[PDB]
Symmetry: C3
Subunit: 314 residues, 3 copies
């Protein structure tokens, strides 16, 4: 398989700036070379240059709407180009608002994609249900057709056309869902496995049911949007909205190892890594190292091991 890296050093979907350092620290960790060690022809499309939008006052309670909207608009273009190039897109975040542009761009070339969303949160607040006003907790509401008519015309987002159905997304890892978001989940009949389901079934059954749900009818490309706070803070502490009782390192690698095995991975997001929020140098390396490992598993690095198609014993 071939890979296209896109850096997205953007943070205006939330208050803390350091998340725009995600792509820098992920590359410093040797991600490109490590990808190249696997079954990968890898091209770096570099970091997106997100021009400042100094005039961007809140839309109602919604913060930095033009900056967020433009960044996702730009991102969508790059993703779509990467996809036209026949490559799997790898977006390095950056805050999670960017999924608006990443999924959009992906869906331009592969309208039939299904989404697996790994996260402690549902990120499905509308501009009218959000309490925080932070757009990184709203991206999914912008993408789902079933919610069009519930998203106001927000400055910066006129270009958005919700092209994804509520029935084509699965959540894994949920453990902090706003009441408005829970209402939306139940109302639209969205498939999810909160931490309660993971505890009940085991990550094994979870992935079986997730892949069966998305791929049962027919094969179709997979978009994995991975928020690092989906994993427990003991593995990814350097992130903006940590929530205890998260997925383990092991469960994280399991999810992605199983997704690799489908051979349908088409787009990937690695989001919300914020080195500024590491309490110590070790917390930063711990968070980045975990992020890197999740990424490699998506592209074939397996715990049981890997080998080239040759005779190693001769």
């Amino acid at each position: 398989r071939t890979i296209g890296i896109i850096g997205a050093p953007f943070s205006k979907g939330q208050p803390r700036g350091g998340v725009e350092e995600g792509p820098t620290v992920l590359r410093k960790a040797g991600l490109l070379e490590k990808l190249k060690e696997q079954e990968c022809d890898v091209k770096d499309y570099g970091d997106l240059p997100f021009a400042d939008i100094p005039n961007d006052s809140p839309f109602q309670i919604v913060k930095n709407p033009r900056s967020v909207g433009k960044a996702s608009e730009q991102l969508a273009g790059k993703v779509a180009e990467v996809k036209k190039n026949g490559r799997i897109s790898l977006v390095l975040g950056g805050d999670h608002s960017l999924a608006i542009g990443s999924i959009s761009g992906h869906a331009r070339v592969h309208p039939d994609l299904g989404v697996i969303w790994v996260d402690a949160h549902t990120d499905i607040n509308t501009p009218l249900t959000t309490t925080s006003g932070n757009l990184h907790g709203q991206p999914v509401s912008f993408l789902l057709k079933e919610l069009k008519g519930k998203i106001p015309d927000v400055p910066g987002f006129s270009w958005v056309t919700p092209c994804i159905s509520a029935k084509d997304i699965v959540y894994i890892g949920l453990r902090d869902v706003d009441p408005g978001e829970h209402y939306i989940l139940k109302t639209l009949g969205i498939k999810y496995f909160s931490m309660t389901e993971v505890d009940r079934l085991g990550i094994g059954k979870v992935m079986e049911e997730t892949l069966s749900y998305l791929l049962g009818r027919k094969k179709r490309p997979i978009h994995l949007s991975f928020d690092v706070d989906g994993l427990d803070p003991s593995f990814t502490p350097a992130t903006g909205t940590p929530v205890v009782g998260g997925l383990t390192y092991r469960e994280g690698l399991y999810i992605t190892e199983e997704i690799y095995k489908t051979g349908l991975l088409s787009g990937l997001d690695i989001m919300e890594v914020n080195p500024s929020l590491g309490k110590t140098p070790e917390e930063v390396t711990r968070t980045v190292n975990t992020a890197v490992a999740i990424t490699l598993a998506c592209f074939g690095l397996a715990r049981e091991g890997n080998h080239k198609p040759i005779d190693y014993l001769n």
Copy 2:
């Protein structure tokens, strides 16, 4: 549902005094208000005033028997009143000897209750099998009918009538059981899931089997006596008798989330929280925060999220 809080700042069931601070720190953590945020009409019956009994020399090897006996005697009265008031009793410990009074009082109003006991220990030593002499490791022996005739007349406990059958209790979390206690388990045929069973089956199957065991024949009220050392010390370090390899935070919330879903929770104990034993301020907050979370789950706080019966989208 309606709730009745009872503080039980008592420690004479064991050597370390700080456990009598349990109710203070649990309330300081905002427990009442957080309960009120859920489907709860909550009333605080305050903290029990446990008068000193200066003259309380050991009965054989058994320590502080009159103090322990009186405290449980008082507790039983309060629990029974809370129960007559139609409310779920919430006892904030306090050492685990208090379960003698809590379960007793509960059973006065609901003779048909079943008990789920979450703990690293079985707390089923008799006054004659105990090695420590600490009564917090003996409460279950005082309650089981099948053991009457094996409990001597201990000062302070004349009021006790064992009204619970060995067949109506399930242990979850066991990993440090005295040889005498193990004999009693096997001999009375008590249902248990030690950590070995949890590892084997998964907490999912565990709760399925636990609830089937207690509720199969017919619905009946549930009493949950939760010792915080049931959870691994990495989540509840500030407790008197920590034992490694415990239940996870996740497993803890799972147990209680499933118990909530039955709609049969009738009495709850949150025991052995001792802030004095926290190695650092963070260990204390970690322990208290975990205790609070377990409590909220018992009353409906779910990881997948919660919402009121209204249209959130309008």
Copy 3:
């Protein structure tokens, strides 16, 4: 059952010397007495005296080959004697290269043994596939009949006769396997449960399948070679080659508790404990304490508890 302890303070199978302190720290922890507390008649055959071999230059890339070879040669003799004495052999490592001698010696008396290998690594590099040259990452290649013809004549190892079949070994815990090793796994059809399989199935199913695989056809002695780095570094940090995402303390006790229950445990290795590598005094005690607990479980210490065949209630 009866037990024979053998100390193997040897480290030349790898670069770090402190692993030769394994037997000292394991005994200081009270292992002998604790074994004696269980169903054990225990004899200490002491620590093997491994004479220096000052002249031991690398064979090709393979390091300290004569020292490693002699130590395993000596170890095999002691194990075989312990086995002739009708006792379960308990080898305290020491680096993992010693499994060459331990398994060999065991197999002299019990040719029909099956091996369970708990480890983050497969330790199945040949002298010609190894990258490190460290012999502790090669012991299994010396033992398997199917690989004879692929192991060159290495100084110090002329005494080795591979008497174990690839079909009679199961790995549990794998998460860092060299490409050459992965080739060997797939090629010889070796049964393994890497961490991916553990995540998928649960340690319960894992042990069921492991024991069924080795014991289905007929009963036969079990040799457990336990590398402490099989467990996550959060439980055994003081070890030479830690790898994240390991087996839990709980999973560790589960494996060994199930192995005890078969009544077929015949040989045991407790390897790669290196107190020098503990970052703090607590890391050393944590590592040693975990090592001790795994050991006791192998000999009957159960989490649900233990009791003698007597009436404890009278």
